[PDB]
Amino acid sequence: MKEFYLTVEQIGDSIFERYIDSNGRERTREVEYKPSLFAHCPESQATKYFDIYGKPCTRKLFANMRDASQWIKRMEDIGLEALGMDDFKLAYLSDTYNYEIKYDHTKIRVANFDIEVTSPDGFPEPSQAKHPIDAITHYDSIDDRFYVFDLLNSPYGNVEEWSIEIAAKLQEQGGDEVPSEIIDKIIYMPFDNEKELLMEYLNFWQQKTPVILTGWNVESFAIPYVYNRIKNIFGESTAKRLSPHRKTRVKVIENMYGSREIITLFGISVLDYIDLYKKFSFTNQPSYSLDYISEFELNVGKLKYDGPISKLRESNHQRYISYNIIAVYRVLQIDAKRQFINLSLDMGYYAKIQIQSVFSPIKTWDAIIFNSLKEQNKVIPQGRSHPVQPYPGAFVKEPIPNRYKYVMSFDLTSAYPSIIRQVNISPETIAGTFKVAPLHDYINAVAERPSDVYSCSPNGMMYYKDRDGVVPTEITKVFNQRKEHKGYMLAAQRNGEIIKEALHNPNLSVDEPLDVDYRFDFSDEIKEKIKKLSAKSLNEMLFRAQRTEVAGMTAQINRKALINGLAGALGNVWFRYYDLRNATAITTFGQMALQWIERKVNEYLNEVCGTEGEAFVLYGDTDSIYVSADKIIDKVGESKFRDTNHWVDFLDKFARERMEPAIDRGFREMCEYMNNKQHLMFMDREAIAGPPLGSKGIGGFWTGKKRYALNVWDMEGTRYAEPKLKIMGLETQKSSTPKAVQKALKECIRRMLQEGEESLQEYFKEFEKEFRQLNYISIASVSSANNIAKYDVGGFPGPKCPFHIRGILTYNRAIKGNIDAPQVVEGEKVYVLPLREGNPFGDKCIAWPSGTEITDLIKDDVLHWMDYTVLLEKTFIKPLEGFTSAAKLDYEKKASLFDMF
DNA sequence: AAGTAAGCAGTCCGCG
DNA sequence: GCGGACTGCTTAC
Ligand SMILES: Nc1nc2c(ncn2[C@H]2C[C@H](O)[C@@H](COP(=O)(O)OP(=O)(O)OP(=O)(O)O)O2)c(=O)[nH]1
């Protein structure tokens, strides 16, 4: 097999590499890598190396990496560009793997671990590590085993061994319900003392040294805790055995609020699953406890135990250990679904970076572009410092607030990356500038044509047309991968809808789910067998389809994020190819494109309706348009349609056969106007939206920019079994809005769009009457809590103190004295509730850590003093008033003449 | 980490 | 009470 790296490090003048050799074995080597860098040289000097602008360079081979780094410094002293890849490990990887890496994940040791630390005096700080580690569960992907290290004797209590027999039993048998499918995979090791446990853990670690190291909060908790505990007991040399090269750095993570310590383990790639989830999931959660996320992702119930965690080991060691094991398994289950480790490996190996570098789009693109240029013997420019400067972004149309009955939406496929490719925007393709007219003059095609030679953006920039830049070349490659996975995702989605339909008529039989590939549209034969399946088999198939869709979603949306990150990186001062001329060329072209096409669509539709000056485009944001289809439906007449699906078909056909070709003609003209390299503006239909045929539903409404709701029947070619709401920006979509309130607001919107005013009024009346019964957590607001200290003045709110910060201070006074009450963590999220006048907490609100029940000593008082009136007005009535006034609808029945009977 | 546009909650204080 | 200037937070792209 082809060799591939596992990890790479620079340690002084050596590269330390762990890799998989041609026989599939893991090896480690130390290489005295001699790096090269480059200087510009005279034209007369024959060379094969040129910079991205075609200027000749001479290669400088250094005796070692320190000599190279020192040369960079002196070149700065002289004031001359030191060219080439200054991150020597990236150059090493490029030299050593000069081919597209094919990796075999089965050979990569992925370790998932979690530790337990009993602490009677509050949160056990990892920098101090003053308490024994009393449990470690460490799952190894190569062994497929959960290794459990269990401390039986501690100053905080001596306990009996954990029983695998009890662990397996149902909770109704007094057991722990450790999943039957992992029971046989547990290797249990009890220990008489902590020193023995830790020495054995280190020997185990030496034998089975993680390449990828993950778990939940491992970077901020488990890793530094383990490192520091071993350090305290045994000394530094022993703690450094966590690194395969015995090298560690105590690194600081800091922005503007504070600072925390992480331990860099050289020769390991730490991918903390909480950080993976935050970067790759495209959710924003009210809480990031593993309990919370596991429930959301897997629909598993929280791990329930009596009493505080600080007393769980002594009261119920059995459950304490079982929950440690289950916690490790839950992360594996989340990854089986989301496939973020697979994603990281794919992207890391593609770019030829340390795998942990996938968290940095800048590093990722730097490596991609370097490898691409190196292929042509081209030499990358030196990174420079730039002052941060603001620059313009997208255009967003101001909508008229209203209901909108029939709506069709369109938007550009991968807008910013397509603009880069179309215009040929790249550091080395800049050809010059032209005299810019106001943007509206381009939008209306009255400005002079910018260039008869070069490809232009309306910001004044011109680009070469003879050859693609490296940015367009490399962005195209990742775009094509994105396109492939999105195809699989959408096929799985369509397949899901087929199954949902068949579930209306399940057969009474005993049968099996079909063995199919959900990434491909079901054939006619498959569809026929589906119509004969039992509900049990159909539900299992639906589960499998939806898992396939999620896998496709992960693969596609993160590749989209990477390519959109390249467009953004051009406006990031840390990027090697930072250039506000290019960043603004993209965004300004985007503004033109949207407004140009708005004009064209209006012109087209006014022509097919025989009107003049009518605005068919009601809204647009960045690269999208929303077209009112009322007049199209009305031209045939509502009564001519058999059912909802009939007019949906008709609008789909109209969009595809009339609108899209007209859109395409408009964009081809724009391409010629800007003299662009290649027409790549592909604005395809997104949504077909409207009320159910014959109903009083309003179909949709806008309240303002980035705030709307549509009742959708078809989304990018997926025809839903049941209509689905597309809601953007409204409170139903915000993590800050109480859970029960999102739900209730969503139902109000459903009723408005699908059923109408009377239905809305009926629901509102019920919600208002019943809502006081809702669980306090379900009606609490949520906020991030930054800068708690700044606004704290002797335990009381300082000037300008934000409402949620006020609530935290209230909480802090109420739990003062307690070492054991949960502390609010700076930068984490809190639940927030308003408090009625004259409450014993002495302020108008209280906040506590999100994802948790408020501590028992104050819980009863919070419940008693919760201000339900304020909560309802602020989170429910105020937003609902906004939705209904925009939609010209009343949520409460107004008096009428009929009342007099 | 370090793409911009833009919405709403809340504080502070003016607005005769 | 609403509105602007402002901070804070959170979305839509
Ligand atoms: N830097 C950055 N830019 C973004 C992000 N989301 C959207 N944009 C910019 C770049 C996009 O091309 C543009 C249009 O946004 P869309 O959400 O419609 O995405 P795009 O058109 O790229 O992909 P699509 O094919 O519509 O799924 O807005 C983001 O998360 N980061």
Ligand SMILES: [Ca+2]
């Ligand atoms: Ca735990």
Ligand SMILES: [Ca+2]
């Ligand atoms: Ca788009």
Ligand SMILES: [Ca+2]
């Ligand atoms: Ca599309």
Ligand SMILES: [Ca+2]
């Ligand atoms: Ca059937």
Ligand SMILES: [Ca+2]
């Ligand atoms: Ca869009």
